[PDB]
Chains A and B, each alone.
With several copies, the nearest count.
Chain A
Amino acid sequence: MNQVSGLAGKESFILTRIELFNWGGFHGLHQAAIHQDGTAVIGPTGSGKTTLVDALMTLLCANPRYNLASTGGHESDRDLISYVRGVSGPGDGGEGQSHIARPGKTVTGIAATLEREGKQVRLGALLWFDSTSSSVTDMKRLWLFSDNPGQTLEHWLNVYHEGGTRLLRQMEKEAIGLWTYPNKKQYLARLRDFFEVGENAFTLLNRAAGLKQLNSIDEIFRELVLDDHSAFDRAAEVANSFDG
């Protein structure tokens, strides 16, 4: 039983930390440690367990499906904007128009650490608003990849608070083992390169968090694995060309 427990973290990178800052209902800086022999996230329904999974998936995927466990089958209610702003759609009772926890200028950071035989790899994301706007184009994003133990989400937040994106870029220039991407496509490409797995792997990892609404093998295959790759849009273009 315990002999097998040592296999994890030897030939693979295992998650061993999550750090959040102004993410969902996690106001301030929160840190959670994850054991190398499997970990359980437990708590009364309506805390921040789905919030944590969504932070991790945001760090991992390109268009993560938020709250997939309960909203599977239909479109998700939550989005990145509502996590950054800390909206409280569900819990009401004194709801002041969705009770946006952080309506003004704000910064939210998320960070996940992975380890293998003492080698560390940290994924991070800083998402901030400079005004009261809530448009997707008004949120400034900076993704971070690191293999240096000294590059922690706390350090990134300190640098941001001190000197905005200018000092963030300057720190990246003089930092050893840090890579900052302003556009998530390049950051996901770097993740793909490091972990030698295509986008389908992380998309499937995302879909795995919504396995509750399962059915016969056919639905599990056509809805969980072997992602869509459908051709319902190409058919429309073909039809329009044939109309011409």
Chain B
Amino acid sequence: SETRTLQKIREATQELLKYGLLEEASKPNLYRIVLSHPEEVTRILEPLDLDIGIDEIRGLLYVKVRLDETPAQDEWAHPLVRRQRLNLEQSLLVAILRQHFVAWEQESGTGASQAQIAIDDLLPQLQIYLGDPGSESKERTRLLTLLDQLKGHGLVTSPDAHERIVIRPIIAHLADPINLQALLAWLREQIAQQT
């Protein structure tokens, strides 16, 4: 005699917490379940100071920190969500991928599918700002390591047999893309000053 939460809802919530996101492409059942009962999931996440951000255009759900009033606390802290600041190279790569994803969305309409990109298409972009590591092999190694690090954060996938990687929809929401734009502008201005 109890009030156990629906098994499917519990599974969806645990999956969402474990992965922080739910893609209709990967887990259609859990995504549909969460869509069917959004109030239940938001109530479940309320005690943990968390919430779900629906995005039906891209078929993506994600966990957003539903903090308290926290007046203008730019340094908000959450016990369960650990904040990370990316590197200079990692931030540059993220900005490049984000702008490419935005361009793909524009050219295929909002909510497109599988915004892909090619490693050879990214190497020159990285070389423009970061410079030349000293060889083609070193350039490829650097790009591959950066892509691996980004995949660890869940922003891109591993290259396929065609040396292509798909930008994941989670790039659409990155808290403060304005910082990414400012970094890109600063990098391009520095390069122009060099030349």
Contact = CB atoms under 8 A, between A and B. Distances in A.
**Is there direct touching of A and B in the complex, by C-beta distance under 8 Å?**
yes
Interface in A8-59: none
B85 interface: yes
Contact of A179 (B87, B137, B158): B158
Given A158-B85, A177-B148, A172 B158 contact: yes
For chain B, what secondary structure do more than half of its interface residues adopt (helix, strand, loop), or is it mixed?
helix
A183 interface: yes
Interface string B120-144: 0000000000000001011011001
B153 to A, nearest CB: 10
Given A176-B148, A177-B148, A196 B135 contact: yes
Interface string A194-206: 1010000000000
Interface residues of B, number: 14
A193 B141 contact: yes
Given A176-B148, A183-B161, A186-B161, A193 B85 contact: no
A192 interface: yes
Contact of B158 (A154, A158, A173, A196): A173
Nearest to A145: B144
A194 B161 contact: no
Contacts of B138: 196
A182 interface: yes
B194 to A, nearest CB: 18
Interface size bucket, A side?
A: 10 to 19
A141 to B, nearest CB: 14
Interface in B138-195: 138, 140-141, 144, 148-149, 152, 157-158, 161
B53 to A, nearest CB: 21
Contacts of B137: 192-194, 196
Contacts of A177: 148
Contacts of B152: 176
Nearest to B163: A186
Given A158-B85, A196-B135, A173 B157 contact: yes
B157 A182 contact: no
Contacts of B157: 173
B136 to A, nearest CB: 8
Contacts of A158: 85
Given A158-B85, A186-B161, A193 B148 contact: no
Contacts of A196: 135, 137-138
Nearest to B139: A193
Contacts of A186: 161
Contacts of A172: 158
Interface string A143-177: 00000000000100010000000000000110011
Given A173-B157, A182-B161, A186-B161, A194 B148 contact: no
B78 to A, nearest CB: 15
Contacts of B135: 196
Contacts of A193: 137, 140-141, 144
Nearest to A179: B158
A199 to B, nearest CB: 13
A190 to B, nearest CB: 8
Q: Output the residue of A154, A183, A190 with the most chain B CB within 10 A.
A: A190
Interface of B: 85, 87, 135, 137-138, 140-141, 144, 148-149, 152, 157-158, 161
22 contacts: A154-B87, A158-B85, A173-B158, A176-B148, A176-B149, A176-B152, A177-B148, A179-B158, A182-B161, A183-B161, A186-B161, A190-B144, A192-B137, A193-B137, A193-B140, A193-B141, A193-B144, A194-B137, A194-B141, A196-B135, A196-B137, A196-B138
Closest 6 CB pairs of A and B: A193-B137, A196-B137, A176-B152, A193-B140, A193-B141, A194-B141
Given A173-B157, A176-B149, 7 more contacts: A154-B87, A172-B158, A173-B158, A182-B161, A186-B161, A193-B137, A193-B144
